[PDB]
């Protein structure tokens with residue numbers, strides 16, 4: 001099973017989405033450092049915002065705890081993709097933390113959803129993660 005790491009604030013919407021997924025995951029805490037050991041997709045919500053014509057370098061979209069988690073070189077090395085949450089009322093900033101992580105960390109942006117996600121989002125992410133980890137079996141070392 002693929003690795004999953006997520007962050008969720010007091011509103012618990014990303015936590016609720018992860019619980020609906022039926023896939024195990026590690027939660028980045030409100031404070032404190034953690035470490036992981038195997039490759040993972042990161043699920044994160046978007047904060048900050050308000051800028052109608054945004055830029056991926058304007059700070060505040062990626063939760064500070066996620067930035068700290070990815071400052072650990074080992075954690076960062078194991079990131080393989082990102083899924084982001086937000087609120088489409090933010091328009092050009094919808095789920096922008098996914099844009100920031102994907103572009104600045106150089107990993108694919110797999111999916112995005114609103115708040116705790118719909119049943120269709122849950123199914124799409126389950127299927128998308130299965131396809132994602134299957135594709136890694138096309139990158140195996142030579143045995144010769």
Ligand SMILES: Cc1cc2nc3c(=O)[nH]c(=O)nc-3n(C[C@H](O)[C@H](O)[C@H](O)COP(=O)(O)O)c2cc1C
Nearest residue numbers: 008009011012013014045046047049086087094095
């Ligand atoms: C202070 C604040 C700023 C937010 N900024 C954005 C934003 O820029 N873009 C976006 O799509 N959603 C934004 N949101 C919506 C959150 O990403 C959304 O509510 C998310 O589901 C919260 O996830 P969580 O409950 O796991 O923390 C913001 C929410 C808050 C409270």
Ligand SMILES: O=S([O-])[O-]
Nearest residue numbers: 009010030047063
């Ligand atoms: O409340 S959390 O986003 O620091």
Ligand SMILES: [O-][O-]
Nearest residue numbers: 070076104105
């Ligand atoms: O920073 O990935």
Ligand SMILES: [Cl-]
Nearest residue numbers: 009010011047
């Ligand atoms: Cl809060």
